[PDB]
């Protein structure tokens, strides 16, 4: 006999990026609340910024900017080490893309609160980050 069971991601299960930045499932938060960008879209996973000082995780930054640039233009971007020298760094070439695409060079964009309704002064950084379940 071979049973089947359903398992869905409940509060307390794990996730993980592709750079060891292992997270966890904190709590669920109705979509009527989350911010909304300028163009009406609604983040589906929120990420604490306190990590990356004392993580040296720069993969997440560079490759999230990458995910956005890709899904915009239409093509898939390579990610092999040792290609981008100190001469033509990753960030600079790789934000030139968002520039000629139409978003802010440093991969940030404004955002509105979801309980007040008021704009927020300090801009926000959004991207598209691959996510393995555990």
């Amino acid at each position: 006999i071979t049973m089947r069971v359903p398992r869905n991601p409940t509060i307390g299960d794990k996730f993980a990026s592709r750079h060891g930045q292992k997270g966890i499932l904190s709590r669920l938060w109705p979509a009527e609340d989350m911010p909304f960008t300028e163009s009406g879209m609604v983040p589906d996973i929120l990420f604490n910024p306190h990590g990356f000082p004392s993580r040296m995780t720069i993969g997440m930054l560079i490759e999230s900017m990458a995910g956005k640039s890709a899904a915009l233009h239409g093509l898939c971007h390579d990610a092999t080490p040792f290609i981008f020298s100190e001469e033509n760094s990753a960030l600079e070439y790789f934000g030139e893309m968002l520039k000629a695409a139409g978003y802010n060079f440093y991969g940030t964009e404004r955002l509105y609160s979801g309980i007040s309704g008021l704009e927020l002064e300090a801009d926000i950084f959004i991207g598209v980050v691959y996510y393995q379940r555990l």
Binding site: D78, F84, E87, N88, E96, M97, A100
Partner: peptide, 15 residues
């Protein structure tokens, strides 16, 4: 005499 290789780095810059 020695043999060279091409150099890849600078890729397509934005459309």
């Amino acid at each position: 005499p020695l043999q060279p290789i091409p150099a890849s780095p600078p890729p397509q810059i934005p459309p």
